[PDB]
């Protein structure tokens, strides 16, 4: 029924609100709170390992909160563990980078990072200017579309719930979950007159891979660096 589709939309939004780490209103309220030049210089003078370690902890924390998101979605716990692991492996870092747009301010090209807004410059010590620039771009393109909370909650669910990921054992059970979300998302977009937004979405697979690679690298090499 119509209210049944409406139920699932509000419940995906609920699950998103509960697992999104920081509230949008807090993020929006803190736009004026910007790192000073002194504070920028502090981050830039950190060792490459110090800065990577911090950001990998954040990236890790983000992935865990996407897992919590997935756990609350309708049929996810009912899938076999193998499928749960396949969907989250293939999908979580992409969800993380889409969530990231909410902490991005497109007016001043800054992002909320450890309690204040800062630009690309903050992340010089990472030694990956191109990756940082690309992620800022992706965030900029996402913010421009001016997602509702519902749009993000539903779109990120669809990033996860995908019956096309290699190595599922129960494709059909994923397909039903994916279709149900598609049906719900389609109704919501139609009633809001937002059908066209998903045509405009910037490519996220490559970037997410590189974030995932870096996370893997830091854990792999942790014994050649100071105790965490």
């Amino acid at each position: 029924s119509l209210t049944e589709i409406e139920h699932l939309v509000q419940s995906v939004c609920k699950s998103y609100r509960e697992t999104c780490q920081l509230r949008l209103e807090d993020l929006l309220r803190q736009r004026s709170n910007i790192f000073s030049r002194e504070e920028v210089t502090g981050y830039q003078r950190k060792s490459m390992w110090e800065m990577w370690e911090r950001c990998a902890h954040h990236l890790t924390e983000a992935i865990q909160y996407v897992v919590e998101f997935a756990k609350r979605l309708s049929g996810f716990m009912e899938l076999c563990q193998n499928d749960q692991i396949v969907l989250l492996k293939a999908g979580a870092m992409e969800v993380v980078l889409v969530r990231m747009c909410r902490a991005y301010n497109a007016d001043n090209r800054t992002v909320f990072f450890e309690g204040k807004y800062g630009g690309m410059e903050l992340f010089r010590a990472l030694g990956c200017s191109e990756l940082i620039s690309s992620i800022f771009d992706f965030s900029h393109s996402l913010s421009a579309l001016h997602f509702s909370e519902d749009e993000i909650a539903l779109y990120t669910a669809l990033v996860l719930i995908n019956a096309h990921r290699p190595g599922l054992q129960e494709k059909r059970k994923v397909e039903q979950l994916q279709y149900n979300l598609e049906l719900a998302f389609h109704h919501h977009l139609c009633k809001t007159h937002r059908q066209s937004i998903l045509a405009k979405l910037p490519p996220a697979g490559k970037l997410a891979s590189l974030c995932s690679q870096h996370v893997e690298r830091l854990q792999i090499f942790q014994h050649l660096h100071p105790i965490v």
Partner: peptide, 15 residues
């Protein structure tokens, strides 16, 4: 297919 992420995700799925 990255093994770093799988470990985080496995650990997170418990409990």
């Amino acid at each position: 297919t990255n093994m770093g992420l799988e470990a985080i995700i496995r650990k997170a799925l418990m409990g």
